[PDB]
Design a protein around this nucleic acid. Structure first.
Lengths: 66, 66, 66, 66, 66, 66
RNA sequence: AGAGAG
């Protein structure tokens, strides 16, 4: 499982991440949680629960070790 | 399971929530209930059954306790 | 199950619902049936079979009891 | 199962159908086949295999008995 | 199973096929193979692995035998 | 399985692929890993985790053997 | 957030 490798690191190394969404919107934050369906993003003040189905791409601040 | 503590908790506390849809359209209100597939939002007196497949992000009012 | 309650109640009541589609399009009419994948809507004497995957939000005209 | 009722009739009564798609495109034809994933449309000369996932709505030429 | 006789047959006969994507973009070519999730199209010398979730419609050259 | 062959072969060969996204967006880089849900792409020293649900087409630079 | 595909 890359996805889970990727995301748990980005989570415990508190990396800043841009989340690109399906529509083109770009969100920036830190991942504080994830399950099979959803990502929990700390992003500009707020806790936003993102549906994985609406995410296109994670562009990390610093590249992850996998 | 974060999705489900997120949703149940913002439901118990009538947190005011911004739901952003996949299309960009954004909706505002409170979650009356949810199941596997759908989120019942009240939106100023009014009921909207939203499919979660049409939902991108929950941005609640202040931060819940997970 | 909120979806099925919500949806059998609007079918029963013969409620006028706005169905916003994923593209923003809006239909209106009344529900005549559903299954796990589809909603049959009458909208001006015409039956339209809508897939639930293309639906965003059902906004009914009087809130529902569930 | 409405979906299958609907579609098998529209198929054996050779009804003309507009298929509205997720993007708004409108296609017109007769259903010559369907499986769980796909619809076979006779539509302006050609046999087009449509993915159900890309279909929003079937608007039949004459309303179906269900 | 229509999808699968459709695809295998247009693959055996290098039928020229218009694939319309979900976005409207349309692509033209021949199907080299397919699996559960993906259609290998050759498109003038060139290989494109397309996810079927990104595909709306197959419009082949003349009509195949199903 | 064509997808996994296709994709392990471009990962092996270190091929330059264009990945067209569902929105039309184009990325380019090379595949470093995949799982059943995601592709890890390096595109200019940066790792991007793309979901397969957001991918339309992988257009590689030299056709693949499968 | 009222529908004809590069």
């Amino acid at each position: 499982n890359i996805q889970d490798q990727f995301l748990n690191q980005i989570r415990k190394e508190n990396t800043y991440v841009t989340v690109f969404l399906l529509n083109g919107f770009q969100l920036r934050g830190q991942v504080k949680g994830f399950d099979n369906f959803t990502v929990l993003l700390e992003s500009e003040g707020k806790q936003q629960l993102i549906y994985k189905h609406a995410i296109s791409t994670f562009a990390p601040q610093k590249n992850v070790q996998l």
